[PDB]
Amino acid sequence: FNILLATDSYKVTHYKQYPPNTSKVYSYFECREYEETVFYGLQYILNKYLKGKVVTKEKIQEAKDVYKEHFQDDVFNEKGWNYILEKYDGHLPIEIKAVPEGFVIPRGNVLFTVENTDPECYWLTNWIETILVQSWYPITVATNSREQKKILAKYLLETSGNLDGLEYKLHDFGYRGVSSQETAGIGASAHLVNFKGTDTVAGLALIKKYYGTKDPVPGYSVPAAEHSTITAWGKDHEKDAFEHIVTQFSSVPVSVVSDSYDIYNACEKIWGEDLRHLIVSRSTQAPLIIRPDSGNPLDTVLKVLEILGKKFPVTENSKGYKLLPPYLRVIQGDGVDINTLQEIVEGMKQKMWSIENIAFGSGGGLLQKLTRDLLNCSFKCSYVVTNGLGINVFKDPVADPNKRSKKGRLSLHRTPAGNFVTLEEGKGDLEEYGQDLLHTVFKNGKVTKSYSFDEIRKNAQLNI
Amino acid sequence: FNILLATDSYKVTHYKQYPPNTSKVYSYFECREYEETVFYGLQYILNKYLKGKVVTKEKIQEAKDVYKEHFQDDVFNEKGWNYILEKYDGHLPIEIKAVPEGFVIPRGNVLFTVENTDPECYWLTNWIETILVQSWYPITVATNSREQKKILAKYLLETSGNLDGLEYKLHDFGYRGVSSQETAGIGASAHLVNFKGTDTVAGLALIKKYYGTKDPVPGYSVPAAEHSTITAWGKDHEKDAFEHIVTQFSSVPVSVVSDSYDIYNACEKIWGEDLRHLIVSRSTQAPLIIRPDSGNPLDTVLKVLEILGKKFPVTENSKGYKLLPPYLRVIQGDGVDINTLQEIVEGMKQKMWSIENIAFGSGGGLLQKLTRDLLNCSFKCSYVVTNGLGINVFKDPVADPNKRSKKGRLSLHRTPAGNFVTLEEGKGDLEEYGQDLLHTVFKNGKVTKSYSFDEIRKNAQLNI
Ligand SMILES: NC(=O)c1ccc[n+]([C@@H]2O[C@H](COP(=O)(O)O)[C@@H](O)[C@H]2O)c1
Ligand SMILES: NC(=O)c1ccc[n+]([C@@H]2O[C@H](COP(=O)(O)O)[C@@H](O)[C@H]2O)c1
Ligand SMILES: [Mg+2]
Ligand SMILES: [Mg+2]
Ligand SMILES: [Mg+2]
Ligand SMILES: [Mg+2]
Predict the structure, then answer these.
(1) Distance from CA of B92 to the nearest CA of A (A)
(2) Is the domain of B388 the same as that of B403?
(3) How far is the CA of B320 from the centre of ligand 4 (A)?
(4) Is B333 annotated as a binding residue?
(5) Residue A173, exposed/middle/buried by CB under 10 A (0-12, 13-18, 19+)?
(6) CA B458 – CA B464 distance, rounded (Å)
(7) Which ligand has the nearest atom to the CA of A257?
(8) What's the distance, CA B4 to chain centroid?
(9) Ligand 3 ion local residues (Cβ < 5 A)
């Protein structure tokens, strides 16, 4: 990895475009005006990509050669990069201040700021915009996961009186559905800020290496069938498959995909009659989890629950809602996103089924079907020093007031009523609003403040 | 990287679920029934992740210890992985057959197949489903990019009578807007199958390392301003910024973002009047490229063109369409995806503006706002041998005939009319349709067939 090759190409040409005599460029990141965002993921980027000696004579030469062919022109700032190497031993003269990881902040507030600490490196603040803006992804995954957690909590609470097992109600199925192995790790780690169930193994080592937990691992799974392990038995032998599987995993929870041929037959006749004896004998800590995986997500869930409630003994919990026996549960892992998640729990509630009965798995909806536009993430320059004089800068496009950016040096504060405000134009210095919530997390190639994954989870907790 | 930790958790448990005495699992990938897909990107995965000694004693121990905590149980197949290490020196006993990279194949056809080459490793076929399914991403980027090239080619040909410069009409702006560095390189490389203009530098090294080109680099950029390089001058010095930048890059093309405050004033008064003398003196190989970046993408493009047409000498080309002078172009880089690209070129044509006048930049629309469900990409087991007996397997969910999978051993063939057909149930062996178009690309830890990026580009060419 070479940071000289990890920017948008045009930024290679920007040192020539700033006003002469500019000694400082100061920039900030926000989720421009999903009302609140979980701040998460900068720490990964700082450590993996930005810290320590990131410039070598070899990396300078490699970039020079690449850019000469890429632009068909010599535009690369070899002098500026050589300055960083000889003067700072390849360490970035940059200071980054950020809200603590896991913090839950309203839209349209400063989340982190970036500035150069040596006047020669004015061009470098925005060099690393590209790398840092990629923080949109763990923010957005963490925020969207936590929004699905609110929906789950609300409905579990209304239908059961408590939130037991909430952290296992939405399982990460997204490893195959994301764009790369690196994306898998990051996105899976962001989901684990809110939940504990994952099949995206990649998230585990990222957390262990960049954040840390007191528990041996941040995420857990259970044995579960796929269509290959059912269909391999042959079309007439679905029952044999089911029997073999629940018997292999008789004393842990086991999820068994039941829609290979006919989900409704599988529930009513195979589980419901032929194999019933192997189900009712199961432990409360070791249920069968029936998994549909096709059909209209809501209709399928409701029809599966209706079948199961006629074949197995159903109770009525203290809230008035129906509850399958403890050795029997359902997971809906097809077509699940924040919208369909809401539709299903509401549809369940209308039909008087407790949310205790159901869990969700989500792949693409959880980790891939998300863009930087969803929270309007944006990195902009708000302050420059030119000829020793600070000026407050910003954009304000005539046809889109929504792309207006903030002016000057910025700070984040608690308001008197306990909310948040971003102060502009250096007005945080007047100190009428308490301490800046932004902390220096990076300075001159060193990570200066770190959060464990346990503090992040605490910070991102629901109101509850 | 540890391949033993690069699968969906549940697959760690599958070796215990297949029928006893299973010696072969055979699986295939298709884009289930955008009617044609560009097959691209498997070779990256084969080289980066799958080839060579991928199993060590230390990787087996890492995974053993993680899985023990992750499942709270010993499910992990330590013996199976040890078998591979001892018997094959950690080389995977797997054969992958694939259509050539760059090939354009209709939906619902076999693209690659995976099978184990040692009966002991029957479980390994679907172990690596998760890693291989990630091929959806480069396939989908290359396909969607090529679909945009088709729209661009149509309207450029219609408005100008040729396709000159088509390969530079859609530029990759997506580095910051993807979910990771690895994704940026993969996606940017997929776009470069069709086009040559890119700001996502990560794409280049990926192509060089994994595919190779005749040319020193597979993609190119030009100098370009961003908002910080205009706004740093101060609201009242937008003209000074513009003058400095076009004069710094007076002999190469230069893109200048012009909507910091008022795109229409910038075009009509700053470029059109105050600085017009610095523009009309520019060379054909060094245009000024005006970049709007806000507003309704079509309305903004049409009004910018109308403004410039009144300030600059417009000609009418041989097809009857209006053409700005050759020192002056426009690039629309905000809000661009396949739908808005179509709307702008059609709206342009409607108002009699040649598509010569315009180029596009696209970030999230190009590399991020894409999922595995756009081409319905799916990896499934179709054939198994159990007790020396081969059986044709498949799923066929009752409530979704779209999820029906193919049966048995598969081959891809040319029809008598030169179309494509996927033969099922081993019927390729009858030889009524010529020879299988898949080639073994991986066998027993070695890449056995490879394509250069130049061959890929030729394969992926448009008809026209
Ligand atoms: N443990 C599991 O049951 C498990 C894990 C990973 C993926 N899956 C599969 O992934 C699919 C969901 O993918 P998307 O949400 O990306 O469409 C489900 O259809 C499911 O079959 C299942
Ligand atoms: N050379 C360039 O002008 C250039 C390069 C990379 C990104 N960008 C910016 O990225 C934005 C596009 O982002 P999305 O397409 O992902 O929304 C544009 O608004 C543009 O300002 C521009
Ligand atoms: Mg599935
Ligand atoms: Mg699917
Ligand atoms: Mg922009
Ligand atoms: Mg934008």
Answers:
(1) 19
(2) yes
(3) 49
(4) yes
(5) buried
(6) 13
(7) 1
(8) 27
(9) A 293
Which CATH number does the domain housing residue B296 bear? Answer: 3.20.20.70
A contacts of B71 (beta carbons < 8 Å) = 220-223, 252
Residues facing residue B37 across a β-bridge: B105
* Pair B156, B140 in one domain: yes
Q: Sort B327 into a burial class: Cβ within 10 Å, 0-12 / 13-18 / 19+.
A: middle
Instruction: Tell me how far CA of residue A115 lies from CA of A14, A79, A387, in angstroms.
Output: 16, 20, 17
Give the amino acid at A75: V
Nearest alpha carbon to residue A264 among A324, A310, A328: A310
Containing structural domain, residue B56: 1-133+372-450
* Chain B residues whose beta carbon lies within 8 Å of the beta carbon of residue A225: 10, 14, 17
Residue A269, both tokens: 């006749």
Nearest-CB residue to B70 (from A75, A204, A240): A204
Residue with tokens 């207006």: A404
For residues A62 and A143, state if they share a domain: no
Interatomic CA distance for residues A91 and B275, integer angstroms:
41
Which residues make beta-bridge pairs with B380?
B28
Q: What are the structure tokens assigned to B458, written together?
A: 């030729």
Q: Does the beta carbon of A333 lie inside 6 Å of ligand 1?
A: yes
Q: How many domains does chain A have?
A: 2
Indicate the helix (H) or strand (E) that contains A75.
Answer: none
**HSE-up (13 A, CA, CB side) for residue B264:** 9
Closest partner CB to A180 (pick from B5, B182, B216): B182
Q: Supply A20's token pair.
A: 């002469």
Experimental technique used?
Answer: X-ray
Q: Looking at ligand 1, which atom is closest to the CA of residue A222? A: 1
